[PDB]
Amino acid sequence: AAKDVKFGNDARVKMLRGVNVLADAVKVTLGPKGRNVVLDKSFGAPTITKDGVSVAREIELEDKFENMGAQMVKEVASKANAAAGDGTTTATVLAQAIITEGLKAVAAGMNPMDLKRGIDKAVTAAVEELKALSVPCSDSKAIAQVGTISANSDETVGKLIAEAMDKVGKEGVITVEDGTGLQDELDVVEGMQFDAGYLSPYFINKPETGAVELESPFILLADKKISNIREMLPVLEAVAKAGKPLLIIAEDVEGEALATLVVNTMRGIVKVAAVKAPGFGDRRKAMLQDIATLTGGTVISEEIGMELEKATLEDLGQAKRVVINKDTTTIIDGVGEEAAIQGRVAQIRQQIEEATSDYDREKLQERVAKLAGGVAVIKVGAATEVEMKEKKARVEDALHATRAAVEEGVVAGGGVALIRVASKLADLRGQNEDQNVGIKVALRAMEAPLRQIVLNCGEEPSVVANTVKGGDGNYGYNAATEEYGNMIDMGILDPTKVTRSALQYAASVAGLMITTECMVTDLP
Amino acid sequence: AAKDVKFGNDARVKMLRGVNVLADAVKVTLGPKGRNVVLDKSFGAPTITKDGVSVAREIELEDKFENMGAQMVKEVASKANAAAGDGTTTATVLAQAIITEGLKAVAAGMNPMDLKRGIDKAVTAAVEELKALSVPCSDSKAIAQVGTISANSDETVGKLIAEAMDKVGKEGVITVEDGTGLQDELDVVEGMQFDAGYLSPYFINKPETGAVELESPFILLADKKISNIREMLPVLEAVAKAGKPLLIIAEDVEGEALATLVVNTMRGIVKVAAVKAPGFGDRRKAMLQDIATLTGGTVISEEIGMELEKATLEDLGQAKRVVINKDTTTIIDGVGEEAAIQGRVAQIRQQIEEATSDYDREKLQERVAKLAGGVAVIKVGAATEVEMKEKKARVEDALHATRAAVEEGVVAGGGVALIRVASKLADLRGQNEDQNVGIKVALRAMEAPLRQIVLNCGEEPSVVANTVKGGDGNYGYNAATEEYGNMIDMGILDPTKVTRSALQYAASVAGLMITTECMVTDLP
Amino acid sequence: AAKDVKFGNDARVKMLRGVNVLADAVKVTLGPKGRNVVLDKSFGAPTITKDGVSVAREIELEDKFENMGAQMVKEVASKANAAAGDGTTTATVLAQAIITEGLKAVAAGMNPMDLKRGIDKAVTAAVEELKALSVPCSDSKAIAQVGTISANSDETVGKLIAEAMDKVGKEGVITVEDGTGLQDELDVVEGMQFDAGYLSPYFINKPETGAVELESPFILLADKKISNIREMLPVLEAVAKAGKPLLIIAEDVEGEALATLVVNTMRGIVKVAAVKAPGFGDRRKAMLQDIATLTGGTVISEEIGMELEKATLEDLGQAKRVVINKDTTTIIDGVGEEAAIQGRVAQIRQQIEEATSDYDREKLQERVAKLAGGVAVIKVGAATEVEMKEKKARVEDALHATRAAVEEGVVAGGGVALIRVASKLADLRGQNEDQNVGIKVALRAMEAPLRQIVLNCGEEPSVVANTVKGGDGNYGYNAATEEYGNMIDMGILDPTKVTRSALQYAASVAGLMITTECMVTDLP
Ligand SMILES: Nc1ncnc2c1ncn2[C@@H]1O[C@H](COP(=O)(O)OP(=O)(O)O)[C@@H](O)[C@H]1O
Ligand SMILES: Nc1ncnc2c1ncn2[C@@H]1O[C@H](COP(=O)(O)OP(=O)(O)O)[C@@H](O)[C@H]1O
Ligand SMILES: Nc1ncnc2c1ncn2[C@@H]1O[C@H](COP(=O)(O)OP(=O)(O)O)[C@@H](O)[C@H]1O
Ligand SMILES: [Ca+2]
Ligand SMILES: [Ca+2]
Ligand SMILES: [Ca+2]
Ligand SMILES: [Ca+2]
Ligand SMILES: [K+]
Ligand SMILES: [K+]
Ligand SMILES: [K+]
Ligand SMILES: [Mg+2]
Ligand SMILES: [Mg+2]
Ligand SMILES: [Mg+2]
């Protein structure tokens, strides 16, 4: 098809306008004081939301050049949220800030490449500054505070996550579920999570999460060298009449006929998923039986002579809920007797101190953490079905952010961290003036989140920013209470990974737009 | 699809317009002097109504932003109606008033978050104030009055609800059914209601109200806990032959049993439902025999050596209609013989005289109230199928609003209650001027129903409002006779629940629109 | 879908326009001198008609608001003719006069509710004046005149009806069906009519009369409600194999039974129809037996231990024809033995001497009336197909108007009665000035029919109206002969009910339009 082709400022103005539409709609929702955005549906009542992610999903523009701008920022901002578990709105605000000033500098005739170079140097520096400024998240009070902030000021979610980690540890495995109702519930059941992905896509159920999920699955374990689908048929008939889904764990899955396992489940007849066994040699086999003892079943080894059609249903292990993934498999509520589990845990212990090299000492210590660790299950309570499912969503978001906070620590929220990092960079320079201006563009933009938060409050951004800047450290503005104080003392905490990622991704896409001379799209 | 995106004032003006169209159409129908609205239909003659529910249901606007505003207020007014059984028009009027004055303040530069805070603070105060002002609805004269108001102004439906309660008690069981015609008839049959619900949610044949409806079902009463589906078969077969659905009331239904029955129920092979028998020990036993006597069935007791397999079709009780929701089971028109039910009642009244414990005595009297209480069935009237089906949702709503009047009491009608409460709130203040303005916005809005009622009379609303304010308590304006008097004495009563539900729901949507900065919809 | 919403005077002009189109098209056909209306067909030559009903049927307007106005008046005017046997054109002419003046008064700023009250008050008074002005219709002469007038000066029709009543009595049961030959025929047969409608609308054979037609069918009589199809199987199979339709008369038909019968009737297969047994208690049982005695059939009761599966073809009664309306059911030519009927009549007449209640006396005498009275059948020959249906439809209208003449009496035709009544009300007043204007609106409207009748004659309405006014009593203008004289003497008679119903219905719809603030319809 023939193309519409724009260059230079003509192209760049278009991009900026589309970015301005996306950002202006997303950014009004920033903060505890964020405004509502009404999102139409083709039927019934409109959706009213303060959630920036929801607002961003909906944005598509008629003008194809403007729309290219909006989509570029959208993709980048969502990458951030996927990496750190939060910060979509903050990233979008940043992108708009850098993009606006950067383009201003381009139009003034400054070197675009130099502007991009300077923005990058500021960001590289800003990221280091954040690492230094960062502080560990350890005590459960701080952890609760992080969750609460990610749950949009809901002290219950943060209280739930902190309670979960208080059971299975901050590094422990945690899964969220729908409860019977009316109050949050917490139970630590038997189960484990190991790293394996599903061997082929299309296995995904509930595609929004992009992870496969089953309910009360049968579990199969083998060496997997085997042959292929044709031989293993006999076990497939028994399950079909249960009926129960099957999760096959094996050294790998090679077979094409084995790859015809994925297809027929697409037809909906029987729901199944296959996943590899982690590691090689005696290490993976010991872990195969590790899973067998947990799920109350025996592994099938073509070495020992055991054949897959020789394996009865009761012989195959079983669990309650299982969630596999691209990088991960998780077993919830394994039906294996606690006598088999604890009996083996003491054995893993025995091998520890007989083992000499510290590499065997560790990995082995990893398996004992899985069997003896279990899986924390958060059952979300509420008054209603729809009022519940929302909260299950907010708990899942707060969880990843808290995980983030555990890894890289926390910083002053409310955009205080970025504002402090900017002051620390005041003396930063590049190789020439253009790069210098690029650095200043990035530093000015670091003020955007706080100002937008303040703006959504109905307060003067210049006034709060000026007052905050006149203070030091963790001194900042609490937008909920309209008070200045110590942000950490007040419980307003961003995971450092989130703040970092938001800046990096925004600077990425901004660098590209600033460096764009040409756009090509179809004819309207 | 590409979207149309509007911000701030430009957006809010559109919302206000849509609200204005919706509310201006709906509010002319408020109160005894309400004007007619003609509603078109694709085929045949138009409909003419004073009922705001019918008018609002029909409103959809061409401009997509305007339409969003209207749908927003609509959703909120219908929720009010679903909660209190009435108040749709009042809710809509309050909504337009709060929104109108709030948006004025926003465009005058005031803080929307503070405006919303003031509104919320004022409504909260008003809700307590209403609860204090509330007075009990007990005597038959008052119930008929509340029914007539909820009618509206139909002494037939109003009276009819009174005998219904007068016969079965104000706490009694009253149900609305289609009826043959051409009048509405009230029948009292043998039936009761106890607290039990579907052991599985999958048994629901009516998703809207979320309940199980079995027509002319057989009823199985067994003491044993049901686990294996095998022992059920001899009875399950005989039930499939008869062509009637089955209801299972037992100690419990679990394991293979609960799993099996719900499996086939989803399929076409069976229509059935099961519930847990209420109570424990001898009471659970005594209650099962209660239900047995009502339905003409025999309790199957594994204690005596009675087995499920031996249980025949005659052993099952029968009823015309049974309704199982989440929290309760309702058995309508049991087949049991009066001589037996009367004897069963006589037996229990004996035990009451023999009762040493006040607790044991209260529990027994609850058993007779259910057995001797019966169930009130209202079969809806008129002629054609269009009104007849529509009328049923009316009387149901009227009955609901009447129950709510008995539970939460009554306040002066004709918008007088809101007027009074707004006077008690004259000294109420917020944190800042903008919250004060919000409080005043809400307090003026509370005058809107009475003013609108009067305006529909062709009378000056400011004179009537001012004259009512000058009086105290229940002094108000009777819009039927165009004369002042005592609202309670003149029989003009609102369920307190309706009034507060309308205020709360209206202030909800108003706060949302006042805090909306962005709207997203499809292209024109 | 999105709607077009109009308010106030803007809406009411549109409504007025559509009313003016309808009424101006229809009113030219009023009276003996009515003009021609040409009605186009999609092919060939146009259709020419003096029939006001045919003209109204065609009117649909492009502007949806205007069209709403026209359809509102058609529907109501159509109702007068359904409850009377005439008056549709009179009602339309009346509606337009009231609507026009009323709407003009509203636009002038007068209180619409007050105007409606004044109109209603005048109509109530006029209805009373009509009642006092009314005179009995007794002798065969006046009965024939009433039928003649409603048949459009056809003396054959009034003569035929009067012969029907001369046999079976003025309150007797009469039915008109297709004439076999060129000449009409009248036969009195044993049969009855009672009030039962079709339980479902979904079975009616002929769309124009909206009634069920069953030829030589079976009649089922059951003392129980039938909730299950399985009890009707043995009898239902017998009937389908006999090549005869089935009429079901029971305590009720509901559940799977009714839904199924609207299946195997509506869809195809054999024709069947069901009606409720009139009344309740023992009167329902007594009445069921009455039908059984008349139809030569046996009542099936659970009370004696009878069962429907045991019911053979011999237990069912039968007749030659059964016509089931919405309101009524008519059995024509019962198969029962006269010795059985006369013995049943005697037993009922015996219970009358034993009756201790005056209510019991009256209800017993209407059963002896149905049994002993029988039915008068009218078969009307036109000499050709198209003329027979047309004439037969005139006889059906005249018959209905004659019953109305019998019940409420007759008054002076040519719109003389309304003029006379309007001159008696000249001093009638109201609560205030607006009501007074409302009364005058009604009184002026009362002259519209006479004036239109004269205008259609081509004389001056003003002159003739004034001459009639200046006379007294039954003095009026004969529009056929163009001479004045006594309207009763000249044979021009309107059943009081027709004049009444015409005025009342016209004033009803006019009251609604005068009180309308809003109209909702589809986008253009
Ligand atoms: N009480 C508060 N005062 C100031 N800032 C707050 C407060 N609560 C939350 N925030 C800030 O709001 C930001 C997150 O807002 P949010 O609307 O969730 O956007 P994102 O999608 O970027 O997480 C964080 O920077 C957080 O510190
Ligand atoms: N005689 C009366 N005088 C004044 N107000 C009345 C009278 N009768 C009913 N009302 C009031 O009219 C309102 C109900 O109007 P309605 O059209 O039903 O609106 P809604 O849908 O909000 O119930 C109630 O507040 C009720 O008290
Ligand atoms: N010879 C007559 N002279 C004067 N008026 C007549 C004569 N015959 C019939 N009418 C009048 O014509 C009117 C009947 O109008 P018609 O054309 O049948 O419309 P509709 O019956 O639907 O009102 C009656 O008021 C009747 O009195
Ligand atoms: Ca739409
Ligand atoms: Ca249409
Ligand atoms: Ca043509
Ligand atoms: Ca009189
Ligand atoms: K937010
Ligand atoms: K109303
Ligand atoms: K005519
Ligand atoms: Mg967040
Ligand atoms: Mg109401
Ligand atoms: Mg006529």
CB distance A406 to A170 below 8 Å = yes
B90 lines ligand 2 (CB under 6 A): yes
Pairwise CA distance, residues A119 & A446, whole Å: 11
Q: What is the resolution of this structure in A?
A: 2.7
CA distance C485 to C475: 5
Would you state the structure tokens that stand for residue A391, as one six-digit string? Answer: 């909260």
What are the φ and ψ backbone dihedral angles of A523, each rounded to 5 degrees?
A: -85, 130
Choose the closest CB to B113 out of A59, A61, A457: A457
> How long a stretch of residues is chain C?
524
Name the residue of A55, A86, A90 whose CB sits within 8 Å of the most ligand 1 atoms, as the mutation to test its pocket.
A90
Classify the C-alpha dihedral A220-A225-A226-A232 as positive or negative: positive
Cβ–Cβ contact B59 with C under 8 A: yes
C520 touches chain B (CB under 8 A): yes
CA dist list (Å): C406 to A28, B491, C134, C328, C496: 78, 44, 11, 19, 10
Q: Is the CB of A34 under 6 A from ligand 1?
A: yes
Q: A273: which 2 tokens? A: 């998923």
Q: Tokens at residue C197, please?
A: 């409608």
Q: In residues, how long is chain B? A: 524
Contact present, A205 and A323 (Cβ < 8 Å): no
Tell me how far apart the alpha carbons of residues B141 and B158 are, in angstroms, rounded to a whole number. Answer: 10
Sign of CA dihedral A451, A457, A463, A465: negative
Radius of gyration of the CA atoms of chain B, in A? 27
For chain C, what is the radius of gyration of the CA atoms?
26
Q: Does B2 touch chain A (CB under 8 A)?
A: yes
Is the C-beta atom of C397 inside 6 A of ligand 3?
no
- Backbone φ, ψ for residue A448 (5° rounding): -65, -45
A88 annotated to bind ligand:
yes
Is the CB of C32 within 6 Å of ligand 3?
A: yes
Residue C180 φ then ψ, to 5°: -80, -50
A384 vs B: CB within 8 A: no
Q: In whole angstroms, what is the distance from residue B236 CA to residue B244 CA?
A: 11
Query: How would you label C106-145 residue by residue, b for 16+ Cβ within 10 Å and e otherwise?
Result: beeebbbbbbbbbbbbbbebbbebbeebbeebeeeebbbb
Q: Dmax of chain B from CA atoms?
A: 82
Does A32 carry a binding-site annotation? yes
Pairing of strands B317-324, C475-478: unpaired
Q: Is the dihedral of CA C136, C142, C147, C152 positive or negative?
A: negative
Q: Tokens for B507?
A: 């202030």
Domains and CATH numbers, chain C: 1-136+410-524 (1.10.560.10), 137-171+379-409 (3.30.260.10), 172-378 (3.50.7.10)
Backbone φ and ψ for B400, nearest 5 degrees, come out as: -55, -50
Q: How many CB atoms lie within 10 A of CB C56?
A: 22
Amino acid at B98: I
* Partner residue opposite B5 with nearest CB, options A21, A35, A46: A21
List the beta strands (DSSP E) in C255-381: 272-276, 317-324, 329-334, 375-380
How far is the CA of C110 from the CAs of A171, C104, C436, in angstroms? 79, 9, 11
CB B19 within 8 A of CB B45: no
Q: Give the β-pairing of C185-189 and C173-178.
A: unpaired
Quote the tokens at residue C369: 């009336």
Can you tell me the distance from the alpha carbon of A408 to that of A400, in angstroms, rounded to the nearest whole number? Answer: 12
Residue B377 CA to residue C498 CA, distance in Å, equals 40
Closest by alpha carbon to A385, among A208, A214, A182, A154?
A182
Angle between helices B64-84 and B88-107 (to 10 degrees): 130
Please report the sign of the dihedral spanned by the C-alpha atoms of residue B169, residue B170, residue B171, residue B173: positive
Residue with tokens 């997203």: B520
What b/e readout covers A132-159, taking b as 16+ CB neighbours within 10 angstroms?
ebbeebeebebbbbbbbbbbeebebbbb
How far is Cα B269 from Cα B233, in angstroms, rounded to an integer? 13
Whether chain B has a CB inside 8 Å of the CB on C74: the answer is yes
Q: Cβ contact (<8 Å) for B180 and C252?
A: yes
| ∠ CA B348-B350-B352, rounded to 5° | 75
To the nearest whole Å, the CA of A229 is away from the closest chain B CA by 30
CA distance A68 to A74: 10
Angle CA(A56)–CA(A61)–CA(A65) in degrees, nearest 5? 115
Distance CA A440, CA A452 (A): 19
Chain centroid, CA A322 distance in Å: 19
- Measured between beta carbons, the chain B residues lying within 8 angstroms of C524 are none
Q: Which ligand 1 atom is nearest residue A81's CA?
A: 21
Whether B250 contacts B243, CB under 8 Å: no
**H/E segment holding residue A408:** helix A385-408
Contact C332, C189 (CB under 8 A): yes
Structure token pair of residue A417: 């961290």
Residue type for position B451: R
Chains B and C touch (3+ CB pairs under 8 A): yes
Judged by CB atoms closer than 8 Å, whether chains meet at C516 and B37 is answered as yes
Cβ burial A312-325 (10 Å sphere, 16+ → b, else e):
eeebbbbbbbbbbb
Hey, is the C-beta of C286 within 8 angstroms of any chain B C-beta? no
Q: What span, in angstroms and rounded, lies between the C-alpha atoms of A159 and A179?
A: 17
Which residue pairs, CB below 8 angstroms and at least 24 apart, start in C236-244? C238/C312, C238/C313, C239/C270, C239/C272, C239/C313, C239/C316, C240/C269, C240/C270, C242/C218, C242/C313, C244/C216, C244/C217, C244/C218, C244/C318
Question: Contact C456/C34 with Cβ under 8 angstroms?
Answer: yes
List beta partners, residue B39: B47, C520
Contact between residue A408 and residue A137 where contact means Cβ atoms under 8 Å apart: no
Of B37, B46, B62, the CB nearest to C517: B37
CA–CA gap between residue B356 and residue A402 (Å, rounded) = 60
Backbone angles phi, psi at A435, to 5 degrees: -60, -40
Q: Which residues neighbour C172 within 8 Å (Cβ) at sequence distance 6 or greater? A: C164, C165, C373, C375, C376
Burial of B396 (C-beta count, 10 Å sphere; 0-12/13-18/19+): middle
- The three-state secondary structure class of A366 is helix
Residue with CA nearest ligand 3 atom 6: C414
DSSP state of A113: H
* Closest approach of A45 to chain B, Cα-based (Å): 5
Asked if C274 contacts C226 with a C-beta cutoff of 8 angstroms, the reply is no
d(CA C304, CA C312): 17
